[PDB]
Design a binder for this molecule. Structure first.
Ligand code: HEM
Ligand code: 5L9
Length: 529
């Protein structure tokens, strides 16, 4: 009765292992984790308290490639095989996806102690925006920062922003090489060139003020480009590897936040604090409820985060609006008639109030956001084991949950003929979003308590967007002027481009070109240039 002999051979086998030729160790270096990964999944599949896990060949990497390149096609296939709740491995992480409205509820309305946004996102945003704000701070601090920013995003502020945004659009039509409407009556543009520029010019002028706008006419503008490059999914995996891309980013954040702090300190020095912009607003209103004041640095960092977030979602969206309308001269025509009726043939100056009397224009924004949600996936890190209602599934702490309202936007069950661009599906329902019942306030205003709406472009719950009305104002003004000034169409045999899902938002694959022409060839834009 000797297992002793077998124990000796374990030890012997171990020493013979360590003495294998390098070619075989390297081999086993790869064979043993590859094999282990596969038997681990098979064992995992037997667990009744876990959602089904998408099978993958490469350890650590997981389904990263197919998810990264075609997330909605990935979800649809998984949904057919497994149903609405399933997990997949992503660059060392386990992601649990809950599709559909119940998914929205599970994640967006999750208890504060159950999940963490900042633990999922801080590595992406903190290097770009700076310390102490958004996700580099406790949730309670984020809630109040959202309250401070929302305090400058009032109806009165929008009434004052509309003519400023309009001035910037007209200036861009007058001065930009992409247009020059006083010199040229037709031309070709890449919308992924023009919309980022139009977006930063309009958002700078209105949210940051004339000083910060004026700086964009200089070499300073290049820092925004640099800071922009740092805003990339690569930050999720390699947040800080010592390359030049990362240094240009870090430098830009310092230079840009330094510029904002210079203005802030100048205004306080001169008692020059009015109600012009978001800077005036945060200077007057940025004291937390425990009495700590945001620092000038944190105020500047919060300005960067707000401008940068709004930059990418808005620019992507007006690009998509232009691209869907380029093959729909019927929609351009209908929008143009609305412009003529609401603005008395163009005799009335556009105001924020008249924007609210443009339902087809607003429905066009609404429908573009349905077909092209800028953020295909939203994430939380699971902090406490979560039971999935009406199942035996438990999502353990350390997992991440993923929700995708943009996926549901594209399902025929909730939006008939979902892959058809049709602004009239929103007839008599042109509001950017609408709360169908009870409300709750997490610290930045009363918002919808339920988050089961199949249309959820602005998310929901404590992390819900506060930029929605600014975006509609900005997009509204911009598109109102595009429509009254130009017609546009595709180059021969071109059509709406497929989305690029790998960038930070779901951009059109470029170059995405349209041909514009002036509705009034002789019309001139005044002002000095
Ligand atoms: C078409 C335009 C936009 C869309 C579709 C959009 C979408 C969203 C979504 C889905 C969220 C929820 C994020 C999550 O749950 O993880 C969000 C949050 C947020 N957005 Fe927007 N957004 C847009 C424009 C803007 C603009 C213009 C601003 C600022 C001016 C802005 C600022 C914010 C802020 C501060 C949050 C809160 C993040 C948090 O609490 O964790 N967004 N947005
Ligand atoms: O939600 C964000 C972050 C985010 C979340 C999910 C996917 C991509 C990004 Cl960039 C993106 N965004 C949402 N609205 C405006 N920007 C921030 Cl920057 C916090 C607000």
């Amino acid at each position: 009765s000797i297992v002793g002999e077998a124990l000796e051979y374990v030890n012997i086998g171990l020493s013979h292992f360590l003495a294998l030729p390098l070619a075989q160790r390297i081999s086993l270096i790869i064979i043993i984790p590859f094999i282990y990964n596969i038997v681990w999944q098979l064992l995992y599949s037997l667990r009744k308290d876990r959602p089904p896990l998408v099978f993958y060949w490469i350890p650590w990497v997981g389904s990263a490639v197919v998810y990264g390149m075609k997330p909605y096609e990935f979800f649809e296939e998984c949904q057919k095989k497994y149903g609405d709740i399933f997990s997949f491995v992503l660059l060392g992480r386990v992601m649990t996806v809950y599709l559909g409205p119940k998914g929205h509820e599970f994640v967006f309305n999750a208890k504060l102690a159950d999940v963490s946004a900042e633990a999922a996102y801080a590595h992406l945003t903190t290097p770009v925006f700076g310390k102490g704000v958004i996700y580099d701070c406790p949730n309670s601090r984020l809630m109040e920062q959202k309250k401070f920013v929302k305090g400058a995003l009032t109806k009165e502020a929008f009434k004052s922003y509309v003519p400023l945004i309009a001035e910037e659009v007209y200036k861009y039509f007058r001065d930009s090489k992409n247009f020059r409407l006083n010199e040229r009556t037709t031309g070709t543009i890449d919308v992924m060139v023009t919309q980022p520029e139009m977006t930063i010019f309009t958002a700078s002028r209105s949210l940051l003020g004339k000083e910060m706008r004026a700086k964009l006419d200089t070499d300073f503008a290049y820092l925004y480009s640099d800071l922009d490059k740092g805003f990339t999914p690569i930050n999720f995996v390699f947040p800080n590897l010592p390359l030049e891309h990362y240094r240009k980013r870090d430098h830009a954040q310092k230079a840009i936040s330094g510029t904002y702090m210079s203005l802030i300190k100048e205004r306080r020095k001169n008692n020059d604090i009015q109600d012009r912009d978001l800077i005036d607003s945060l200077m007057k209103n940025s004291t937390y409820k425990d009495g700590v004041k945001m620092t000038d640095q944190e105020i500047a960092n919060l300005l960067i985060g707000v401008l940068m977030g709004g930059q990418h979602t808005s620019a992507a969206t007006s690009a998509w609006i232009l691209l869907h309308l380029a093959e729909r001269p019927d929609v351009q025509q209908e929008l143009y008639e609305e412009q003529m009726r609401v603005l008395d043939g163009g005799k009335k100056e556009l105001t924020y109030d008249l924007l609210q009397e443009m339902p087809l224009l607003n429905q066009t924004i609404k429908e573009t956001l349905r077909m092209h949600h800028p953020l295909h996936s939203l994430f939380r890190k699971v902090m406490k084991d979560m039971h999935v209602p009406n199942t035996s599934y438990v999502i353990p702490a350390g997992y991440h949950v993923l929700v995708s309202p943009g996926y549901t936007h594209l399902r025929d069950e909730y939006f008939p003929n979902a892959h058809q661009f049709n602004i009239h599906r929103w007839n008599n329902d042109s509001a950017s979003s609408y709360s169908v019942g009870e409300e709750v306030d997490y610290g930045f205003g009363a918002i919808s308590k339920g988050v089961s709406s199949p249309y959820l472009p602005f998310g929901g719950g404590r992390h819900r967007c506060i930029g929605e009305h600014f975006a509609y104002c900005q997009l509204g003004v911009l598109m109102s002027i595009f429509i009254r000034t130009l017609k546009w169409h595709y180059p021969e045999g071109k059509t709406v481009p497929p989305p690029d899902f790998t960038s930070m938002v779901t951009l059109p694959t470029g170059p995405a070109k349209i041909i514009w022409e002036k509705r009034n060839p002789e019309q001139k834009i005044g002002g000095r240039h």
